[PDB]
Swiss-Prot record:
Section of the entire sequence shown: 433 to 593 of 593
Superkingdom of the source species: Archaea
Interacts with target acceptor peptide in protein substrate, as annotated region: 28-30
Residue ranges, Extracellular side: 2-153
Extent of motif DKi motif: 84-99
Name listed for the protein in its UniProt record: Dolichyl-phosphooligosaccharide-protein glycotransferase 2
Role of this protein: Oligosaccharyl transferase (OST) that catalyzes the initial transfer of a defined glycan (a GalNAc-linked heptasaccharide composed of 4 Hex, 3 dHex and a sulfate for A.fulgidus AglB-S) from the lipid carrier dolichol-monophosphate to an asparagine residue within an Asn-X-Ser/Thr consensus motif in nascent polypeptide chains, the first step in protein N-glycosylation.
Taxonomic lineage from the root: Archaea, Methanobacteriati, Methanobacteriota, Archaeoglobi, Archaeoglobales
Cellular compartments annotated: Cell membrane
Length: 153
């Protein structure tokens, strides 16, 4: 996985803008090392074994209430979403599949539209796609194109 322009700008921005290091940044485990070592901020997960399941439960949650349980449990202050995690209308490819699998779902038994309909009710959708406009405890902080960072409130 290569470092994109958007990621470079996002990581540099959080390095000098987020409170210096108490709290953690929640994102998919694939980006953990970047946030931890490049942005110098604690993460919910940076590998598959630990924290990845918490992140998956958060992203696949259908209510802010259920999502806030993970936020409180992990001391989450910021959330980072990425376009490659979302479901796109033009393809079946998306990291939402492994996210679902780790969350305990078996997408291979679901119809394509059932997967899309499910995605449209999740936190990942309400955050990245709707820009948290319909969320009470989350607010879009900075939009780096494919990478977005949200603040917990």
């Amino acid at each position: 996985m290569e470092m994109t322009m958007d990621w470079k700008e996002a990581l540099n921005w959080m390095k000098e803008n987020l409170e210096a290091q108490d709290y953690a940044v929640l994102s998919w485990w694939d980006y953990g090392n970047w946030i931890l070592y490049v942005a110098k901020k604690a993460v919910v997960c940076n590998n598959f074994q630990a924290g990845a399941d918490d992140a998956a439960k958060f992203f696949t949650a259908q209510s802010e209430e259920e999502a806030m349980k993970i936020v409180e449990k992990r001391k989450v202050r910021y959330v980072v979403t990425v376009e490659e995690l979302t479901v796109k209308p033009e393809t079946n490819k998306t990291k939402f599949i492994p996210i679902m699998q780790i969350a305990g779902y078996s997408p291979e038994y679901m119809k394509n539209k059932e997967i899309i309909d499910f995605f449209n009710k999740t936190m990942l959708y309400k955050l990245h796609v709707e820009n948290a406009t319909n969320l009470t405890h989350f607010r879009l902080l900075k939009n780096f194109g494919t990478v977005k960072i949200f603040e917990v409130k």
